[PDB]
Paper text:
The genes encoding proteins that form Rhodobacter capsulatus GTA particles (RcGTA) are derived from phage DNA, which has been integrated into the bacterial genome. Here, we use cryo-electron microscopy (cryo-EM) to determine the structures of RcGTA before and after DNA ejection, and to visualize the interactions of RcGTA with R. capsulatus cells. Particles of RcGTA have heads with a diameter of 38-nm and 49-nm long tails.
According to the convention established for the portal proteins of phages, the portal of RcGTA can be divided into the clip, stem, wing, and crown domains. A dodecamer of adaptor proteins (Rcc01688, g6) is attached to the surface of the portal complex exposed on the outside of the head and the adjacent part of the RcGTA capsid. The adaptor protein can be divided into four domains: the attachment domain composed of β-strands 1–5, the tube domain formed by α-helices 1–4, the adaptor loop, and the C-terminal hook. In addition, the attachment domain of the adaptor protein binds to the α-helix formed by residues 148–152 from the extended loop of the adjacent capsid protein.
Residue numbers in the entry:
A (entry chain A), C (entry chain A): 24 to 79, 90 to 393
B (entry chain B), E (entry chain B), F (entry chain B): 1 to 23, 36 to 171, 175 to 197
D (entry chain A): 199 to 393
């Protein structure tokens, strides 16, 4: 609060502090450029949109606007937090409470403006050369700003993509290494060297038409694999090889593709990266996925939804992830139910309350 | 990048009286056939002639090293347009005198930008000295060891001493190890 | 206490003892620079924010200020202790007790000032060229200073990043080794050597246009892999190789990426580092994570919250981590409940007290 | 010494990634003589056909026609991995040997000694933690008893340490299954008050 | 880094009377073609001529070794600006006389800083002695074994003795093994 | 580390009367061109001339071997300051006479310390003997086998006997195998 007045000016008051930059140059080369950065975001954003939310406003979340639905909104919201570290939400409200629509404003065309004291005064949505200039000098605050943790910046988050931006450039290039090498590389099966009577000498077009017809017809193809190829004086067949055949940047492309999955938090079993097995049998790879990088990410987005939407209706509302209705935590749930189920010393009404059941 | 020279050497500055002693229209036709053979191997100039480096795109933004090595007093940086309005610029860069890399280091900013079609050209007077007595003497000796060969044998015939032509011009050649991208 | 008067002057009384330095040059190259240092902090800070806390002021912790929430505050607090070894907390209090807001002041723009005797007299928050100069010559002490252990310094902590700052520089560079090598390296598939009739001789532009068209059309691509390439007198095809193809600093990049996880304390199974298995099946890798480097870290941060916030209200308060509500200790919990559950010699009211249940 | 090997073998590879010249190759230009440089009009041409057409991932395999005098000798990099790799791990395991931590707990990569962390953590709190704590708390017990009158004892409590549960459950199953002795005689074997 | 010399050698200090005995405008034209050939291989000076090392950036902060090896009495360290106000500095550094590395070791501080555009230049009088009788005699003998070759054969023709030209100047050459970053 | 010599050899001590018999201004110009060629290969002195080793930092604390090998009677150890107050020290070290390593072994203590800027210098009279009849005769024979070569052939021309110049000075050269850190 007190540092509000001193950090705001040191950044430029009343002017837009634009995005970190290079975010677009990472979205089109690291989300639409390689599958490993593509699938890792699509695995997480389709997992956070699948876990139900409980209210400790649900008609707003289940139907935000005329386009994207409840699951399409969170695929679009988390897909901005994973790509650019910043999630934005416009709300339009003709009514004085509980706004009608929620719009995920994309973050690369959005910048903060710090202003006088501490928290920002507005946001600038700049498409083309036209800005909107939202206002935060009021209570309902029409843009929610969900941030990932950034230790050095005050107004944005850190995309797991910015951490793995070198591992994306290795997995793009080592895969475009072999794309190019299959498109511009000359291997021959051999070479018919014709030196001649001198140290050098070309062979006539009456002899070059003969040499092709006896090479095309009698010596090339699968059906001619092994013809003797009698060589006269001067002619010679030197068969060329191709010595690095497989594996041009093969264990570095897999090592880069595993460092991309390390940054986003997906385990390498779920997307199918080939590696030494870490988890055993997908009952614990899926359980570690919904515990290390999905439910911590969802409990920060829904907690910012709970505070921002409670500025529209009167009562403060809580809105947190429901672990009970997620099939990945069944291996967590059945060893709970077998723990106090086999504990026959305590009564029946005392073990319904240990599981979250209403006593009857 | 062309680098055609502005003015050739007059021939009154060449030591045809000294070359004769070491061994006039035939002697002077053999020094400048041996001056131009040594400059082409060493990328030097030896007589401080004027040049015009007319190039189409700057290689870097604080660089474009000049190929002719001993430089002094870049005269102008003419920044032409396509039609040829010929407006010279006068500030932004510095000639940095260096026998290794004669470069234009700029002044903490991107070098003057080139119009679409309008090739920027540099005129500079590069070389050791205006006379023959201002050269390094071994590079002056290497001219005489080569021009006396062109005098004493006319076609490509047959014949290595310790400090020959090649051992004297091995220390003026540009030692480069970049065949890379920048 | 007595050494207070003698160590303070030997350090410079009443002047700011600035940070260790190089902390920023490690935050932007070791937290935003590689995924292994990125994910290891984000794995720990999202784990300490997930374990609930019990009171032996909770409305302050569950809603600190207008921005970051309960889980966003501890992700921001532990993310300063793991990056720079120092956690700071501003509290603003219009009321004489139980302050309204908590702000994690970032540590690289914060320096101590030792002063006269022992404990510091204030703190300097220097952004740009403007300082705030907090005061500690009073009881409520508006900045809490959580430290990691530093054996040689008296006023700061040691970041696990400073220990692994060489292993970050190997994992950044060995990954930028292969990024560069895929961007500036010339391998050819071969070389068509044309010496000529002399010892050297170039080939004419009427012959160079012919040689490209018979190399482009008939000899390059995947669809031309094996054409005979008749070589006349003077021509020659020497096929080049690429002898180190895979694995440029591959087992040193993995050995460096495992020494980064060793410093922060994450086991290599959880982030996905490829290595010889140490733990078995994630039931003990997650249990060792919440026991060696999460719950010792959380029981030091919550214990400094318990003492500092008890300087605002009258009664001394305790605030420690609750192991009962953490799913990683279920393998600890079920072998406890099976130990005294199967111990049928003692009575039912004597085994409810061994588990922390109220006797009925 | 094992710290000085693990610092230096890790700073071996830090330096080697910061000051080492590997080339992908070398375009040797001898010339018509035994030696001869190539002109700046030819060096600007040779870079532009190497930058544009022959470098990068998208140019991996261009034929590179070589005239008379030109030559491409591709250089290698023969020790690529593992510069002091099994000595840095052998030094990093001798550091853990001195302090007493088992190599499973900190994550040193080595042949497995303990099995499944139930005995690696139990050996850690028995060989190098609880002997170290029972000497520090015993010196606290004697020194602080010089301040108050009565002599005081202050020793580690093994009952409230989760690493000794594999020690504790085989104790409770030993005298729990021993049905020959009575109920009040097995509460005293575990440290429970008889009722 | 240019290192052009201030004053050439007068020619009255060269031993044209001694070179004639070993074997005047043609003899003196062959010693300085053999003095400059030996200095360029050994990076020496042999006649204590004056120099001006005008360089743009200091390589280190307690260094910038001088290339011409036998040094004595660095005259000034002129620290110019871009317009050329030419203010010399007089303190902060030490000439450290060393045949191995003639360097400016500074005085426990960073060397004088260079303005943006204003190249710092060093003028120093480096060499063995002002006369010919002050040289090491084998380096004086190597000049006569080379200048008598340039006298006795004019073009690059054909002809190794135990202590030849190369075996006498093999111990004055700069033995360097750093092609690295610092 | 410079090691410039104090006084050159007078020339009255050189055997120009004996060199003439083996085969005066031209003969004496060839012995000292062959004395200095053999000393530079063997790191010897041969005529006991005076030296001044002026160096800036002691390599060790009980060492700094002297390069000129046959030593006797280190005269002084002048320990100068920066302004040049020139205060010599007189105790603490020992000259240890050794043809292998002529070193200053100190006296069970660190050698005299050097001021900031004030380079310590050593003046010593190193060599075999003051006359020519005090040399080892094979090293005296190697001078005559080299100086008679410089007499009998003037430029670097063409021509190995069992005990030649190289086989006689192979046992006076410094045999070193340390290219290391200490």
């Amino acid at each position: 609060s007190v540092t509000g007045r001193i950090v705001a000016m040191a950044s430029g008051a009343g002017r837009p502090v634009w995005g970190p930059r290079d975010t677009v140059s990472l979205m089109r080369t690291g989300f639409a450029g390689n599958p490993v950065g593509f699938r890792s975001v699509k695995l997480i954003a389709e997992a956070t949109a699948a876990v139900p939310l409980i209210c400790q406003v649900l008609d707003l979340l289940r139907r935000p606007n005329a386009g994207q639905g409840r699951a399409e909104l969170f695929e679009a919201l988390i897909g901005q937090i994973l790509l650019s570290g910043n999630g934005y939400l416009e709300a339009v409200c003709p009514e004085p409470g509980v706004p009608r629509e929620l719009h995920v404003l994309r973050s690369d065309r959005m910048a903060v403006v710090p202003g006088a004291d501490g928290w920002p005064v507005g946001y600038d949505y700049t498409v083309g050369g036209r800005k909107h200039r939202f206002d935060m000098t009021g209570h309902p605050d029409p843009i929610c700003h969900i941030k990932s943790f950034h230790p050095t910046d005050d107004h944005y988050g850190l995309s797991p993509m910015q951490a793995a931006a070198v591992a994306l450039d290795v997995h793009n290039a080592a895969s475009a290494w072999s794309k190019a090498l299959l498109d511009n590389a000359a291997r021959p099966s051999g070479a018919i060297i014709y030196k001649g009577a001198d140290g050098q000498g070309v062979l006539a077009p009456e002899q070059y038409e003969r040499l092709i017809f006896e090479m095309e017809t009698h010596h090339q193809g699968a059906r001619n694999a092994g013809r003797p190829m009698l060589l006269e004086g001067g002619l010679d067949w030197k068969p060329m090889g191709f010595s690095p055949s497989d594996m041009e940047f093969h264990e570095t492309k897999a090592a880069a593709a595993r460092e991309i999955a390390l940054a986003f938090g997906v385990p390498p079993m779920l997307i199918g990266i080939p590696g030494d097995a870490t988890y055993a049998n997908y009952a614990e790879a899926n359980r570690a996925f919904y515990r290390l990088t999905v439910l911590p990410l969802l409990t920060r987005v829904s907690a910012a939804l709970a505070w921002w939407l409670s500025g529209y209706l009167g009562a403060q509302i809580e809105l947190k992830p429901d672990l009970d209705q997620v099939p990945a935590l069944a291996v967590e749930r059945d060893q709970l139910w077998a723990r106090i189920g086999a504990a026959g010393f305590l009564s029946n009404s005392e073990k319904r309350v240990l599981l979250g059941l209403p006593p009857t | 990048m062309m680098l055609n020279e502005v003015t050739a050497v007059p021939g009154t500055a060449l030591p045809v009286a000294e070359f004769r002693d070491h061994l006039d229209a035939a002697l002077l036709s053999y020094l400048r056939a041996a001056i131009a053979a040594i400059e082409g191997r060493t990328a030097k100039a030896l007589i401080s002639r004027g040049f015009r480096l007319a190039l189409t795109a700057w290689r870097w933004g604080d660089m474009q090293t000049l190929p002719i090595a001993p430089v002094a007093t870049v005269t102008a940086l003419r920044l032409v347009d396509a039609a040829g309005v010929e407006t010279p610029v006068a500030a932004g860069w510095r000639l940095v005198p260096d026998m290794a890399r004669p470069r234009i280091e700029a002044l903490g900013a991107m070098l003057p930008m080139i119009p679409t079609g309008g090739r920027v050209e540099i005129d500079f007077t590069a070389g050791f000295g205006a006379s023959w007595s201002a050269l390094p003497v071994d590079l002056a000796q290497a001219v005489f060891l080569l021009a006396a060969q062109y005098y004493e044998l006319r076609h490509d015939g047959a014949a290595a001493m310790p400090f020959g032509v090649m051992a004297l011009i091995e220390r003026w050649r540009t030692v480069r190890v970049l065949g890379g991208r920048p």
